[PDB]
A paper describes a structure:
In this study we present a structural and functional description of the bacillaene synthase β-branching enzymes PksH and [name]. These biocatalysts are responsible for the final two steps in β-methyl branch incorporation in this PKS/NRPS pathway. There is a single active site per [name] monomer, with each active site positioned on the periphery of the trimer, ~ 43 Å from one other. Akin to PksH, [name] adopts a characteristic CS fold, with a ββα core, that comprises two approximately perpendicular -sheets surrounded by -helices.
Assays were conducted using WT [name], along with the point mutants [name]-H230A, [name]-H235A, [name]-K80A, [name]-K232A. Of the four [name] mutants investigated only [name]-H230A was found to be catalytically compromised, with barely detectable activity for 3-methyl glutaconyl-SNAC and significantly impaired activity for 3-methyl glutaconyl-CoA. Surprisingly, [name]-K80A and [name]-K232A both display catalytic activities akin to that of WT-[name], with no evidence of functional impairment. In tandem with kinetic assays, the crystal structures of [name]-K80A, [name]-K232A and H230A were determined. The active sites of each of these enzymes displays the ground state “closed” conformation as observed in the WT enzyme, with no evidence of significant structural perturbations within the active site. These data thus imply that the observed kinetic effects are not attributable to global or local structural reorganization within the enzyme as a consequence of the amino acid substitutions made. Crystal structures of the mutants [name]_K80A, [name] K232A and [name] H230A revealed no significant changes in active site architecture beyond side chain identity. We thus propose a His230 dependent mechanism wherein this residue has a dual function both catalyzing decarboxylation and to act as a proton donor to the decarboxylated intermediate 7 to give the reaction product.
Residue numbers in the entry:
A (entry chain A): -4 to 70, 85 to 224
B (entry chain B): 4 to 249
C (entry chain C): -2 to 70, 84 to 131, 135 to 225
Amino acid sequence: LFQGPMTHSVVELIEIESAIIQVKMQDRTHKNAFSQELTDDLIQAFEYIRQNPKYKAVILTGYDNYFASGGTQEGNLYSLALDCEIPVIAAMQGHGIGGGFVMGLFADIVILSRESVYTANFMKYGFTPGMGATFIVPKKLGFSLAQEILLNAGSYRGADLEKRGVPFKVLPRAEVLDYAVELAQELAEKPRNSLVTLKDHLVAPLRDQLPRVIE
Amino acid sequence: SVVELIEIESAIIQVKMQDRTHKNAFSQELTDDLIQAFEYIRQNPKYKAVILTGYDNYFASGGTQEGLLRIQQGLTAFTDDNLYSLALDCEIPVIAAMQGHGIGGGFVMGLFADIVILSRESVYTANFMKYGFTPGMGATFIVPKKLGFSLAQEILLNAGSYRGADLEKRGVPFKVLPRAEVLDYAVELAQELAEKPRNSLVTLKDHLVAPLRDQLPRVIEQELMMHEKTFHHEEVKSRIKGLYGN
Amino acid sequence: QGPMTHSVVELIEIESAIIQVKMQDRTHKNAFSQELTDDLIQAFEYIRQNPKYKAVILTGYDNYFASGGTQEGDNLYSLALDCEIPVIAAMQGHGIGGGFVMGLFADIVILSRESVYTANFGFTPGMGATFIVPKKLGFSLAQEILLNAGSYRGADLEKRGVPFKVLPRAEVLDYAVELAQELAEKPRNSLVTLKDHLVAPLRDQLPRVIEQ
């Protein structure tokens, strides 16, 4: 059960169990902003997972208090989880800001942390959310909360979202990863081909509609 | 006028329903002034957010008793005028600050706002079926769209009355506040929206509601078809007479 | 008040306009035997022939709602969906596999805090379940329920945020009756016209994707 980093060493791959792989985002310099290094290393991580079809669950996470921070001051990640053939769990133990929040919403299962901040903050900068965001937030959070989240671009603690009602488990940051592993262990009780077929079914419409409805 | 138009800061326009006489039911005046208020806002590219609200303990009460009788008689339809879509057609975000009771068509009108805020103490109901006729005003579309299909079946089939607090216990995605705070909250949200450029607000709303603007006419048509089957019976006239405001 | 042919479903008239359909195959704990299937089909055909009824309350007995597909090898689920009037699934007992899914085909779904619910189908839930679960529970929560095929107490679902009334088992049937009385105050025509409108797409889409 190995542990390696990717080419620029800002993602670490950690085999938790024979059929569970954890993708750990750890660009400490950029607090996991979408730098070119995090971008390349994440693609590599999911390319590695595609190349080794023994896994039954992916757990995507960040480090300390940062899940992902979205596009940098200078500056396709979203579809990585959606196109991965097996269930991906976004364990958002840390802040999820902008495209970093949205990216988590494309995983099959999403876990929030109570103390962390989440924001689709695009509009705070004057611009509209990617078309990827505008498509996925309503689908994962419902239409009405998506309106509010996208139009106003405000900042939400995990606890406030929890209070407003979201379908995601919301937990103390210190528990998010443990819960994600337990959940990955339960997923791994299934044959890998049943998980893939079922995922194929559940996300067909997204994979079919996302491509076009992207321009 | 029974509708008052208040600017807040530079770019917020408050639309206050205040037909005290009919408790903000759809009197002919309220209807006309609402259409006109929204026409005037659409013509003003200063505005970036609308706050739709009522007065005192009332947000909006839906059809007047005379109103519903005239329809029941075959004289008029809910599609005459077209209130249901005011907030959906408005290019800028609309906040329904439901500081008071939302009843029947008045509740449904408000649900077409991009952001809906309820009062904990007030009552909300899609009470169309209490009178024995089927939901109008886009209720069969916007209620499942905002509150989810499951909860909407219960709301629409049974026509029950819920306090804001009940809806908050069932898990609705709207912010629920004591009544005294609903309008303050709407204002801060509106200022926060007004910080964005207008073109971005309009463009993002266009993208979020295209599918609603596309689909809503076909649902209005289905609903008119259900009205033709259910409105024009004697037991419906008895219900509008005996159960109104009950 | 009388039983169906195999005796494993009791029809109980609560009032003139409210009919209770009680599944009570005690031997199989409301598993999907031939007898339960035939008796439920019989129950819903009786209801169709007796349009004084304006609401149906579908129920199990004791701590069981229904336990799903028979040790043996469906068309069942469309029973509540194709019923002209509103059906309330008062799931006062466990809902396992198909027994959870059948309840989700009712117009109103009431869970019991203390009861266990799962869509637990080496088999993919197929159906059916992958059809109706996201539509009733919402997409995101469905992904979890389906991918993991986990078991949940009613109280767990209530904390995670379902649109269903979730009650102590002891109050479930009482709440169902109160709601059924409120539904029965509407004219029948109104109820059936609205239901036809609300569940038309489901009636449409189910047959196609019951070959797939």
